[PDB]
Amino acid sequence: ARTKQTAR
Amino acid sequence: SDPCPENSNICEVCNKWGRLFCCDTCPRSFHEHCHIPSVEANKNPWSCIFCRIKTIQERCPESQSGHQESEVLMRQMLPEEQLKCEFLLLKVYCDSKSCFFASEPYGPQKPMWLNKVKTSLNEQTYTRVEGFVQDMRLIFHNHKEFYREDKFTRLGIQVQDIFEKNFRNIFAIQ
Ligand SMILES: [Zn+2]
Ligand SMILES: [Zn+2]
């Protein structure tokens, strides 16, 4: 599965 | 940069940022343990539970009469029933008020909480749909007392309503 790191 | 620019920056379930997994068949994103079942990190391609429910629905369009509740509850937990229960559990977590029922409480003759149901469902402890539905309804049965602060009383009322509406929509009950 593809993944990414996100942030407020 | 954005590695997955056509997927959400925010978890579908909890509406928060972080380490997300990105569906290959729709723009949704999920924390690993917000999705149900847990995301399989190495499955490629990976379709989320919304896409998998949609596929099941499109291939077996529902009847106009629907189903009886007791017929549904008596069903063996075959793979489609397991997935619908996982999606119904996930729709409860999708409400931010679910966090008040998610953890083990700190009274009732059989405490119950959402993370315990998640564990039981993932270990396939429930052999019939009724086993899952009974544990979910126990959560709300255990909270039948007026809270000093009305907002806490209204909370269980609203999460119970979310469960029951989704239960009948997902299983197409009369
Ligand atoms: Zn999340
Ligand atoms: Zn999807």
Side-chain angles (χ1 to χ4, degrees):
Chain A
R2 294 177 302 124
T3 185
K4 62 173 166 177
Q5 185 73 28
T6 69
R8 160 184 166 172
Chain B
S1 196
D2 192 324
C4 300
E6 289 75 40
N7 290 80
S8 178
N9 281 335
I10 262 150
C11 178
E12 190 75 5
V13 183
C14 72
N15 290 304
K16 279 129 76 158
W17 302 261
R19 189 178 60 93
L20 303 174
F21 286 95
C22 300
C23 186
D24 289 315
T25 46
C26 81
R28 294 178 175 88
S29 298
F30 303 82
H31 294 112
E32 170 180 344
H33 300 95
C34 281
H35 193 270
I36 306 182
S38 281
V39 181
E40 346 191 18
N42 289 339
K43 191 165 191 318
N44 297 283
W46 174 73
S47 282
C48 74
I49 187 163
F50 288 79
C51 293
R52 288 168 68 192
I53 284 294
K54 180 170 189 273
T55 295
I56 293 182
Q57 281 166 357
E58 282 171 354
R59 78 192 193 204
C60 303
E62 302 283 4
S63 65
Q64 180 186 97
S65 68
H67 311 269
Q68 308 281 56
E69 180 186 5
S70 53
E71 182 276 306
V72 167
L73 292 176
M74 293 183 295
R75 281 186 202 160
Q76 201 172 335
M77 199 74 93
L78 289 170
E80 274 196 19
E81 274 67 39
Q82 173 88 20
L83 193 75
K84 290 180 170 184
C85 288
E86 288 164 340
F87 186 54
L88 173 51
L89 183 51
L90 180 137
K91 290 302 273 268
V92 173
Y93 279 98
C94 276
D95 195 278
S96 87
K97 304 179 178 96
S98 68
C99 62
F100 298 91
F101 305 101
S103 295
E104 180 184 8
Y106 289 85
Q109 299 306 279
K110 187 172 165 46
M112 186 54 55
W113 56 103
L114 291 166
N115 289 345
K116 181 176 173 49
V117 181
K118 183 180 279 192
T119 294
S120 308
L121 193 61
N122 187 66
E123 292 170 354
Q124 297 180 58
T125 307
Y126 305 120
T127 59
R128 308 203 173 277
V129 172
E130 70 180 0
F132 167 79
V133 172
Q134 277 173 356
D135 274 357
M136 292 293 284
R137 288 176 167 165
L138 181 63
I139 295 173
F140 308 122
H141 289 339
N142 284 347
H143 297 84
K144 287 306 183 191
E145 202 176 11
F146 283 141
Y147 281 98
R148 180 193 294 165
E149 307 177 273
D150 287 322
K151 55 156 121 55
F152 295 138
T153 307
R154 297 202 293 276
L155 213 156
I157 286 163
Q158 294 159 12
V159 177
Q160 180 190 25
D161 212 4
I162 291 297
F163 170 75
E164 293 295 339
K165 295 184 177 183
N166 278 285
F167 171 52
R168 288 174 182 79
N169 298 336
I170 290 178
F171 285 94
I173 287 162
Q174 184 181 6

